[PDB]
Design an enzyme around this catalytic site. Structure first.
Site, PDB file in Angstrom:
ATOM      1  CD  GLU B  93     -32.911  39.785  43.302  1.00 51.97           C
ATOM      2  OE1 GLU B  93     -31.864  39.166  43.117  1.00 51.97           O
ATOM      3  OE2 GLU B  93     -32.942  41.024  43.240  1.00 51.97           O
ATOM      4  CE1 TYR B 100     -24.571  39.037  49.479  1.00 52.81           C
ATOM      5  CE2 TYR B 100     -26.998  39.118  49.471  1.00 52.81           C
ATOM      6  CZ  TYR B 100     -25.791  39.485  48.933  1.00 52.81           C
ATOM      7  OH  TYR B 100     -25.808  40.301  47.839  1.00 52.81           O
ATOM      8  CG  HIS B 198     -32.030  40.768  38.453  1.00 53.73           C
ATOM      9  ND1 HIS B 198     -31.998  40.306  39.742  1.00 53.73           N
ATOM     10  CD2 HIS B 198     -31.940  39.671  37.668  1.00 53.73           C
ATOM     11  CE1 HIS B 198     -31.865  38.997  39.759  1.00 53.73           C
ATOM     12  NE2 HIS B 198     -31.807  38.588  38.510  1.00 53.73           N
TER      13      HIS B 198
HETATM   14 FE   LIG Z   1     -31.845  41.534  41.468  1.00 55.70          FE
HETATM   15 FE   LIG Z   2     -30.122  39.707  44.442  1.00 55.81          FE
END
Ligand SMILES: [Fe+2]
Ligand SMILES: [Fe+2]
Ligand SMILES: Cc1cc2nc3c(=O)[nH]c(=O)nc-3n(C[C@H](O)[C@H](O)[C@H](O)COP(=O)(O)O)c2cc1C
Ligand SMILES: [Cl-]
Lengths: 117, 290
Positions: B93, B100, B198
């Site tokens: 994550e 980004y 996930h």
């Molecule tokens: Fe995730």
């Molecule tokens: Fe993510």
């Protein structure tokens, strides 16, 4: 027609239950003597689950076609397990559907099986 | 005190997810964005703003899921192999969040990027949205947690992984599916296959906990799960109005949010709650890059 399938997290199992078709979860000892359709799920990078690859080494003579469950999030690998089995044994891709399938997918799958028989 | 022993499997699926996280991590370190400047300068001001804003929203959700949701979920699992899978998902994550930033840097000045972060920080709807999900995680900040609490954190986490991201995922896929900003699109595509696995893994963990709840406990968390889902839906419809009306895409997005909500429920073993519809075909084309 008989449906052989493999399911790891339940999606394929839930789809076969909407089917009203005789269907059996594959295992390593399983031999299938009649014509059958395979439903598989899809594992990383568009691959065929190992259990499925084994089961087809011993059972492809009666294989008349293959559907795949997957997730369109995988792009051009969505359902690619059907492509690999289709190519490898020269049988039709019956259909591709996401997760447990929608009613369209179920209806679509049945029509494709008549058409294919 | 137990040490993780991979020579005696604790479940049937952890090893595969372990391997799979690592293989996806590897594909993510190959090429990046820059070629996008050509199409970026062809978007209207309103489009560029929507994009920056959604990416801002994605980064917020990745930050919270790496910095809070994975760690607090994993710190109570007794299954050490799954706990390792989550530690690694948690780190991923952070890799996404950093991606980004990389996209931002190839598209806006440091001053613009900074304004976008100020905006996300101060935006009531994102605070509220992030606030609801993380309230399930924060409930785990204590030495012993109930099965119910832990199940609800896992439901929250899959609603984030498989459902809340998709209101922002829509735009970059939608543009890439039109051959705009397709290098940034390719990064998002990769991030989306991480997030899909996930949400599958956490949903497997969830269904195991649910199978140990009493019948009474099951009925309670089923209720809370349906409440949470629709509370989130209602926030998403409002968020979608704020971001997309300027560019005329509000009902396209809303329908993509329903489509993904139903995938998240199915990650949990649950029946879909929204009417079933085909994926937006331009977004599908964006998913089908490289
Ligand atoms: Fe995730
Ligand atoms: Fe993510
Ligand atoms: C580790 C992993 C890899 C996956 N790879 C693919 C993929 O490459 N292509 C695809 O379409 N779906 C992929 N999926 C999605 C699954 O094939 C899909 O969820 C399927 O419905 C699961 O079937 P089952 O629940 O019967 O196991 C993947 C899922 C997981 C967990
Ligand atoms: Cl999936």
């Amino acid at each position: 027609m008989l449906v052989a399938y493999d399911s790891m997290t339940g999606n394929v199992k839930r789809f076969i239950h909407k089917l009203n078709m005789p269907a059996v979860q594959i295992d390593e000892d399983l031999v299938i003597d009649e014509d059958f359709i395979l439903i598989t799920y899809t594992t990383g990078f568009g691959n065929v689950p190992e259990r499925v690859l084994d089961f087809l080494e011993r059972n492809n003579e009666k294989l008349k076609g293959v559907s795949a469950s997957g997730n369109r999030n995988w792009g051009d690998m969505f359902g690619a397990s059907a492509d690999k089995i289709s190519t490898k044994y020269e049988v039709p891709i019956v259909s591709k559907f996401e997760l447990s399938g929608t009613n369209n997918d179920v209806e679509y799958f049945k029509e494709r099986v008549r058409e294919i028989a | 005190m137990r040490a993780v022993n991979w020579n005696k499997k604790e479940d049937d699926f952890s090893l595969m997810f372990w391997k799979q996280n690592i293989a996806q991590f590897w594909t993510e370190e190959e090429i990046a964005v820059s070629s996008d400047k050509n199409t970026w300068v062809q978007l209207s001001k309103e489009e560029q703003i929507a994009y920056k804003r959604v990416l801002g929203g994605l980064t917020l959700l990745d930050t919270k899921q790496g910095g809070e949701g994975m760690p607090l979920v994993l710190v109570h699992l007794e299954n050490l192999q799954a706990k390792s899978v989550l530690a690694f998902m948690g780190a991923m994550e952070e890799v996404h969040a950093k991606s980004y930033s990389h996209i931002f840097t190839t598209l806006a000045t440091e001053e613009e990027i900074d304004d976008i972060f100020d905006w996300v920080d101060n935006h009531p709807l994102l605070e509220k949205k992030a606030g609801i999900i993380t309230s399930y995680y924060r409930r785990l900040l204590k030495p012993e947690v109930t099965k119910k609490e832990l199940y609800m954190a896992m439901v929250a986490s899959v609603f984030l992984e498989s459902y809340l991201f998709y209101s922002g995922f829509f735009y970059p896929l939608y543009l890439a599916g039109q051959g705009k900003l397709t290098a940034s699109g390719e990064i998002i595509n990769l991030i989306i296959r991480d997030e899909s696995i996930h949400g599958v893994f956490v949903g497997i963990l969830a269904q195991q906990i649910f199978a140990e709840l009493s019948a009474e406990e099951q009925q309670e968390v089923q209720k809370e799960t349906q409440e949470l889902l629709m509370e989130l839906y209602e926030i998403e419809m409002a968020y979608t109005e704020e971001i997309y009306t300027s560019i005329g895409l509000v009902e396209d997005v809303n329908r993509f949010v329903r489509y993904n909500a139903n995938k998240g429920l199915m990650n949990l073993g649950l029946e879909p709650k929204f009417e079933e519809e085909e994926i937006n075909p331009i977004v599908l084309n964006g998913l089908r890059t490289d």
